[PDB]
Amino acid sequence: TVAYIAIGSNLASPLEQVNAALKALGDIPESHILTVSSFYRTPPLGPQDQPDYLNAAVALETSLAPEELLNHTQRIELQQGAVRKAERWGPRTLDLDIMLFGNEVINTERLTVPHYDMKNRGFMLWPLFEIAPELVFPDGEMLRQILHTRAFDKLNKW
Ligand SMILES: Nc1ncnc2c1ncn2[C@@H]1O[C@H](COP(=O)(O)CP(=O)(O)OP(=O)(O)O)[C@@H](O)[C@H]1O
Ligand SMILES: Nc1nc2c(c(=O)[nH]1)N=C(CO)CN2
Ligand SMILES: [Cl-]
Ligand SMILES: [Mg+2]
Ligand SMILES: [Mg+2]
């Protein structure tokens, strides 16, 4: 199944974090990277007392169960020093969010797929569109069309 993973970093040298993350994503068992986006510098969503993010997206082919992929993504966050601050939407050395897991709809305590907020975020949608311009969401919506509708500002390269 192709999983689409959003990468965000705004602490501790985001370019280094993102490169380290991509290496580690490629090392997850029973999986391999298909396509990587460009790297974009994006203003924070949420609290404004934090640095700009590097955002990217990756398409990962995997035979893992979605929760076992999440175990592996969370382990890479840990490996890279991610600390979950008290405040919502605060800074991170690395944030790996599962945007899509093929065409699956997943709603569990640990895991909500498609990512609950992705359709509201150009920092997630633009890098996804770069790597999967023909994507169709589980609900039948085209990514290309969501982008049109929302008219989100285009992103700046890192
Ligand atoms: N699609 C998904 N990808 C990643 N984590 C998910 C997820 N759906 C649910 N989660 C859950 O989200 C929990 C909190 O993860 P955090 O990374 O702290 C959220 P965040 O990425 O800072 O905010 P965001 O989800 O609004 O982008 C995880 O422990 C995990 O169980
Ligand atoms: N620009 C930008 N802002 C954010 C981002 C992100 O990846 N990029 N992630 C968040 C929560 O994970 C909150 N805010
Ligand atoms: Cl959907
Ligand atoms: Mg996130
Ligand atoms: Mg996250």
Swiss-Prot record:
Key word ATP-binding present: yes
Catalytic activity annotation: 6-hydroxymethyl-7,8-dihydropterin + ATP = (7,8-dihydropterin-6-yl)methyl diphosphate + AMP + H(+)
Q: Which GO terms label this protein's molecular function in UniProt?
A: 2-amino-4-hydroxy-6-hydroxymethyldihydropteridine diphosphokinase activity; ATP binding; kinase activity; magnesium ion binding
- Which Enzyme Commission number(s) are listed? 2.7.6.3
Keywords tagged on the record: ATP-binding, Folate biosynthesis, Kinase, Nucleotide-binding, Transferase
Q: What class of enzyme is it?
A: transferase
Its pathway, per UniProt, is: Cofactor biosynthesis; tetrahydrofolate biosynthesis; 2-amino-4-hydroxy-6-hydroxymethyl-7,8-dihydropteridine diphosphate from 7,8-dihydroneopterin triphosphate: step 4/4
Subunit structure as annotated in this protein's UniProt entry: Monomer.
Q: What does this protein do?
A: Catalyzes the transfer of pyrophosphate from adenosine triphosphate (ATP) to 6-hydroxymethyl-7,8-dihydropterin, an enzymatic step in folate biosynthesis pathway.
What this protein is called in its record is 2-amino-4-hydroxy-6-hydroxymethyldihydropteridine pyrophosphokinase
* Organism, as annotated: Escherichia coli (strain K12)
Upper taxonomic classification of the species? Bacteria, Pseudomonadati, Pseudomonadota, Gammaproteobacteria, Enterobacterales
